Amino acid sequence: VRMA
Amino acid sequence: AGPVTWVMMIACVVVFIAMQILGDQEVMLWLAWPFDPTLKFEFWRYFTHALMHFSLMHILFNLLWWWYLGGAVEKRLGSGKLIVITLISALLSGYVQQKFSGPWFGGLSGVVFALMGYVWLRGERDPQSGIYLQRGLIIFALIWIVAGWFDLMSMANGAHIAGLAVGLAMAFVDSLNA
Numbered sequence: 001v002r003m004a
Numbered sequence: 005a006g007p008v009t010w011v012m013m014i015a016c017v018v019v020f021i022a023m024q025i026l027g028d029q030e031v032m033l034w035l036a037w038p039f040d041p042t043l044k045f046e047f048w049r050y051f052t053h054a055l056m057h058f059s060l061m062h063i064l065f066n067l068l069w070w071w072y073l074g075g076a077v078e079k080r081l082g083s084g085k086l087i088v089i090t091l092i093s094a095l096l097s098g099y100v101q102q103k104f105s106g107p108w109f110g111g112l113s114g115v116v117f118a119l120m121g122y123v124w125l126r127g128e129r130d131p132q133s134g135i136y137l138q139r140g141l142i143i144f145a146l147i148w149i150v151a152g153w154f155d156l157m158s159m160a161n162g163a164h165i166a167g168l169a170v171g172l173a174m175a176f177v178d179s180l181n182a
Contacts, residue, residue, distance in 0.1 A: 001028070001032070001058065001108045001109065001110070001158065002101070002105055002108065002109040002158050002159065002160040002163075003057075003058060003062055003109065003110070003111045003113070003157070003158055003159055003160055004053070004054070004097065004098075004101055004109050004110060004111035004112070004113045004114040004159075004160035004163035004164070004167075
């Protein structure tokens with residue numbers, strides 16, 4: 001998962 | 005500050021709290037950008053990805069910026085403006101993050117980078133609006149972008165640049181109609  | 009600033013901070017806390025009770029993955033299953041075209045008509049997902057955060061510093065750091073910059077947009081440009089900056093930017097930044105790296109991302113920072121872009125450009129071209137971003141933050145923003153390009157973490161680099169771009173475009177247009 002990636003964090004915007 | 006405003007109703008829209010506050011409604012959005014309560015949404016992200018409520019969702020953050022659910023991610024803590026249900027687990028991230030469970031909440032991601034429902035709020036994340038469509039991962040499978042069958043889900044493409046589940047319209048809330050083009051937006052809801054924005055409400056998810058994955059640690060407390062994640063949410064705090066985002067709500068911080070959101071509060072500071074979002075409240076300023078609502079305060080001076082009205083709640084309708086902030087809504088429109090939020091929606092278009094969550095949608096477009098989500099869209100580009102998905103192309104960059106697929107649909108497993110979340111956070112409000114795409115919307116934030118649009119806010120930083122709007123507040124800075126609008127404050128530069130139309131100082132009459134009564135917002136502006138201090139240079140100390142436009143440098144912190146810039147460091148922040150590029151620190152995602154090098155990753156020491158896991159940032160949504162498509163979201164940052166897409167949001168950023170959206171906020172500069174909206175601000176440009178708005179500083180013509182001024």
